[PDB]
Design a protein around this ligand. Structure first.
Ligand SMILES: [Cu+2]
Ligand SMILES: [Cu+2]
Lengths: 159, 158
C-alpha cells in the first residue's frame, strides 16, 4: 500500500531493471536530492544481477555505480522532465532513487495522467568502477548505454 | 591463487577480510597503477552480515565505502599509504589496488613482515544516501574506524 510498481521488469544486459515509486522520502545526507517537502513521489529503480551475470556479479546482487538518467513524460499534457537517480539504501536494500515534484512542479503539466517513464543506463566504468581484464580472473566488457521504457498512471502520492 | 591476509574481522555489521593476488590488469587503463609496475594486487572483501543495521541484505557487497590502506614494512620501517578502488572480477565486486613493492624505486618495501591497516569510512562520504523516514528509514552509518591485519610478504604470488 506504500510502494507502487511501474510497468513490468525488463531483463537486459544481465540485469533485471524494475521501477517503483513511493511517497517522498526524507534522505540523508540532506541537500543532495529534492527535499521531501517539495516533492510528490520518490521514484526508484531496482536493478540486480540476473542468473549468469556476464560481468561477475552474483545472482541477485545490486548493480552499483550505475549512471541512470530518467525522463517522465505526461502523454496527456505532453510535459516532459529529465533527471538522474541516485544510489541510496532503505529498509529493503540499496537502490537508485530521487524525490520528484509532480503537481508541485512550478512549470505545470505533471499532475494526474498517463506517463511514459524512461531509464537511461550507463555502465559503472563511467564513474571509474574497475574491471579485472586479466586472463584468469577477468570479466567481460560492460554493456553499451541503453534505455528501458515503462508506462503507468499517476494518481497522486501513494497514501 | 588468492593469498589470505590475517583473519577476517566482523564489526559494524560487516564481514571484513583481506586478500592479495598477483598484479591485475584493470580497465579503464589509467586509474590504478599498471600491473607491469606492481608486485601485488591488494584486495578487501567487505559484505553485509546477517541482520545488517543499515538495510543491506545478508551477503550483499558493501559499496561506495572509502577504504584507505597502509602497509608498513615492520623490518625496514617504511610506510606506504594509498586507496583501494571499487571494481569487479570473476567472483564479484570488491575494493582492490595494484601496489609496487620491490619495484617501488624508493626502496624499503621488499620482503619482510608487514602491518596492514584498513581505514574505512561509511558510504555517505561519496554521496551515497539513505532513507531516514519513519517507514523505510535505516540507522546511522558507523563512524570511521580501523581494522588491522598481519601478513608476511614473500613477493608476487603465483
Ligand atoms: Cu530511495
Ligand atoms: Cu581487484
Amino acid at each position: 500500500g506504500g510502494e507502487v510498481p511501474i510497468g513490468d521488469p525488463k531483463e537486459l544486459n544481465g540485469m533485471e531493471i524494475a521501477a517503483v515509486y513511493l511517497q517522498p522520502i526524507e534522505m540523508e545526507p540532506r541537500g543532495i536530492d529534492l527535499a521531501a517537502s517539495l516533492a510528490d513521489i520518490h521514484l526508484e529503480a531496482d536493478i540486480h544481477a540476473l542468473k549468469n551475470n556476464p560481468n561477475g556479479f552474483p545472482e541477485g546482487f545490486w548493480m552499483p555505480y550505475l549512471t541512470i538518467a530518467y525522463e517522465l513524460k505526461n502523454t496527456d499534457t505532453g510535459a516532459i522532465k529529465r533527471g538522474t537517480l541516485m544510489p541510496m539504501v532503505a529498509d529493503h536494500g540499496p537502490h537508485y532513487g530521487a524525490n520528484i515534484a509532480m503537481e508541485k512542479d512550478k512549470k505545470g503539466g505533471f499532475g494526474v495522467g498517463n506517463y511514459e517513464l524512461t531509464f537511461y543506463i550507463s555502465n559503472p566504468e563511467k564513474q571509474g568502477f574497475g574491471r579485472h581484464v586479466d586472463e584468469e580472473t577477468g570479466v567481460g566488457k560492460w554493456f553499451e548505454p541503453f534505455k528501458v521504457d515503462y508506462k503507468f498512471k499517476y494518481t497522486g502520492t501513494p497514501k
